[PDB]
Amino acid sequence: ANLAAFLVLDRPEERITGINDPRLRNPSDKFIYATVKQSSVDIYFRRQVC
Amino acid sequence: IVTIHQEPFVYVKPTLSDGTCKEEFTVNGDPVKKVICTGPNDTSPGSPRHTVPQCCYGFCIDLLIKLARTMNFTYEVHLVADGKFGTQERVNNSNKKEWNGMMGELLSGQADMIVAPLTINNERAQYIEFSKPFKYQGLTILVKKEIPRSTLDSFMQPFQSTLWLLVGLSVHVVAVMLYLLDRFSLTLSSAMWFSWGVLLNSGIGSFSARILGMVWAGFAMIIVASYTANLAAFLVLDRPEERITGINDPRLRNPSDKFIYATVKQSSVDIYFRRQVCLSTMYRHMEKHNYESAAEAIQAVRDNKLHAFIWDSAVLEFEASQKCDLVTTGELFFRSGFGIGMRKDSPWKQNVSLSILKSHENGFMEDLDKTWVRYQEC
């Protein structure tokens, strides 16, 4: 039973579900992610000011 | 004062032959106050209504008594003749906006102050002034949660039942092959007894025989490993269907006859559902199952008639605590509060607000909740 309980577990962390992922809403140094430059992606991210 | 019949807050019960009600005590032994309440004998319409005196008590009665004691008030509790909160309705000459039910009773001038659970609404506030709420709570979804049972009726292999025949044939062929090997080195049934006993351990029992035993021993664990894996896979499954996650549940967005759920009447819940006009198909099915009273609705839900019921969470949580057969689903949505129905010209606004705030600060609300709305859990 203990072996089965240990084995029923995703070893890797859960993948990103999208923009509304709670871990992405809180920036941190352990998980760093950023755009490249002031291209259309930057404008899209800047447009929704929340 | 006109009050609506709500079980968690108002316990409307018939009186005795002496004109009063029985005297009981709470868990702490304190005497429970009771006031004679005037209302119709029969709640349902189409009956010989009689304004017999009842004896209603509960949660709001203690607050009303405290307000009367601290504010020189002499209250006269009355019951709604219609049994509904009352909103806008269309009658002959439909160009008239006149309230019915409790709101119409208050606006008619017969009632002065109302102490009853009434969700704050913009339309109600445009015509009736409201004071600070007793507490803050929203509305949830009530569903029936029966005891889960093992729905694994596949005693044998789920499909392709020929596997048992295949393994029996394998046993037979390995037995006859062992007989042939013994001949080419154990006469009638010893080999088949051994082949059955190696799978079913009971202690039953040249080079070719060794490798035959090795391969049969290797194959023996395969069947039991597969059976254990299949049993575990079947057992890792929630037998009951997933509970309601909230308003945004995909199954609720698509109405169907297999899962019927509806409100009660044109009360504040109906107005809240109507205000957000994006669920056009929701009212195509909700209006087809409206009932008369919350008591009848919850009785139908308990009788396995309605799969879900929508009402203020303060009632559903109390019902779930009292009876261990219904559960509440969803976190919260459309959070609101109660209030006191008073006319704009009534000069008892500041006094009532200050008294309510002082009572809430002094722990009176906590004691009332513990004594009435907070009971043993399941």
Binding site: - | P158, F207, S208, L212, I222, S226
Partner: protein
């Protein structure tokens, strides 16, 4: 969110082990 049962690959494995056993028996017989 799947349960399933013994698929065709289980039959492939049992056929493979039966073939291996038959080959071993034939080798021992021809020895």
């Amino acid at each position: 969110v799947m349960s399933s049962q013994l698929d065709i690959d289980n039959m492939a494995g049992v056929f493979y082990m039966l073939a291996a056993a038959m080959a071993l028996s034939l080798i021992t017989f021809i020895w």
